[PDB]
Design an enzyme around this catalytic site. Structure first.
Site, PDB file in Angstrom:
ATOM      1  CD  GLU A  34      -3.046  -0.941  -0.033  1.00  0.00           C
ATOM      2  OE1 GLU A  34      -3.028   0.079  -0.783  1.00  0.00           O
ATOM      3  OE2 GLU A  34      -3.866  -1.870  -0.180  1.00  0.00           O
ATOM      4  CG  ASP A  63      -7.840   3.559  -4.796  1.00  0.00           C
ATOM      5  OD1 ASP A  63      -8.265   3.921  -5.926  1.00  0.00           O
ATOM      6  OD2 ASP A  63      -8.577   2.953  -3.980  1.00  0.00           O
ATOM      7  CG  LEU A 115     -11.843   3.627  -0.165  1.00  0.00           C
ATOM      8  CD1 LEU A 115     -11.346   4.280  -1.433  1.00  0.00           C
ATOM      9  CD2 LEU A 115     -12.666   2.367  -0.495  1.00  0.00           C
ATOM     10  CB  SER A 172     -10.087 -18.657  -5.169  1.00  0.00           C
ATOM     11  OG  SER A 172     -10.026 -18.296  -6.538  1.00  0.00           O
TER      12      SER A 172
HETATM   13  C1  259 Z   1      -9.804 -15.436  -2.445  1.00  0.00           C
HETATM   14  S1  259 Z   1     -10.345 -14.037  -1.484  1.00  0.00           S
HETATM   15  C2  259 Z   1     -10.243 -14.556   0.176  1.00  0.00           C
HETATM   16  C3  259 Z   1     -10.984 -13.883   1.135  1.00  0.00           C
HETATM   17  C4  259 Z   1     -10.936 -14.303   2.455  1.00  0.00           C
HETATM   18  C5  259 Z   1     -10.150 -15.388   2.816  1.00  0.00           C
HETATM   19  N1  259 Z   1     -10.148 -15.771   4.089  1.00  0.00           N
HETATM   20  O1  259 Z   1      -9.534 -16.971   4.461  1.00  0.00           O
HETATM   21  O2  259 Z   1     -10.808 -14.999   5.052  1.00  0.00           O
HETATM   22  C6  259 Z   1      -9.407 -16.074   1.857  1.00  0.00           C
HETATM   23  C7  259 Z   1      -9.447 -15.652   0.531  1.00  0.00           C
END
Ligand code: 259
Length: 162
Positions: free
Chosen positions: A11, A20, A32, A117
């Site tokens: 950052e 930003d 922000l 993910s």
């Molecule tokens: C792939 S974004 C993300 C958001 C939160 C967490 N988390 O373990 O709180 C992991 C990935």
């Protein structure tokens, strides 16, 4: 390394209001202010956040105070989110930092599309997670930062920040 040093790298630190990577008014260590295109509106948010009439400028101590609040709030938010808590709790401390980093940058709404993910992370399918994470607007718009965060998730080390 830790979440504070990691976000300070990603950052930066600026003591005057700046825009930003998304063009939004920001100050300090990626704090922000508002998504409003009004600079006067951003100045009001800054004054409210700091508790004085700042005229668009703050000190390092003030920047660090907002930062600590922001990191804390990011974690507390994660723990209150039914979609994020399970994954966060399943992770080691280094990968937890990577999670906080993403939430700090994009917000909880910003991480809504990362469902697949998140599942891969919960499953500890690290290379697969890393591949899936890069299939994102995030990766395309901020690739260098995304690569560091992804490496952190892939490896569970701070190699990307050394
Ligand atoms: C792939 S974004 C993300 C958001 C939160 C967490 N988390 O373990 O709180 C992991 C990935």
């Amino acid at each position: 390394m830790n979440i504070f040093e990691m976000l300070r790298i990603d950052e930066g630190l600026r003591l005057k209001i700046y825009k930003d990577t998304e063009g939004y008014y920001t100050i300090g260590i990626g704090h922000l202010l508002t998504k409003s295109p009004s600079l006067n509106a951003a100045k009001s948010e800054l004054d409210k956040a700091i508790g004085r009439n700042t005229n668009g400028v703050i000190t390092k101590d003030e920047a660090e105070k907002l930062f600590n609040q922001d990191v804390d709030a990011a974690v507390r938010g994660i723990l209150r989110n039914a979609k994020l808590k399970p994954v966060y709790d399943s992770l080691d401390a280094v990968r937890r930092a990577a999670a906080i980093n993403m939430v700090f940058q994009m917000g909880e709404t910003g991480v809504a599309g990362f469902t697949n993910s998140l599942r891969m992370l919960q499953q500890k399918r690290w290379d697969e997670a890393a591949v899936n994470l890069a299939k994102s607007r995030w990766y395309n718009q901020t690739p260098n930062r995304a690569k560091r965060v992804i490496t952190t998730f892939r490896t569970g080390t701070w190699d990307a920040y050394k």
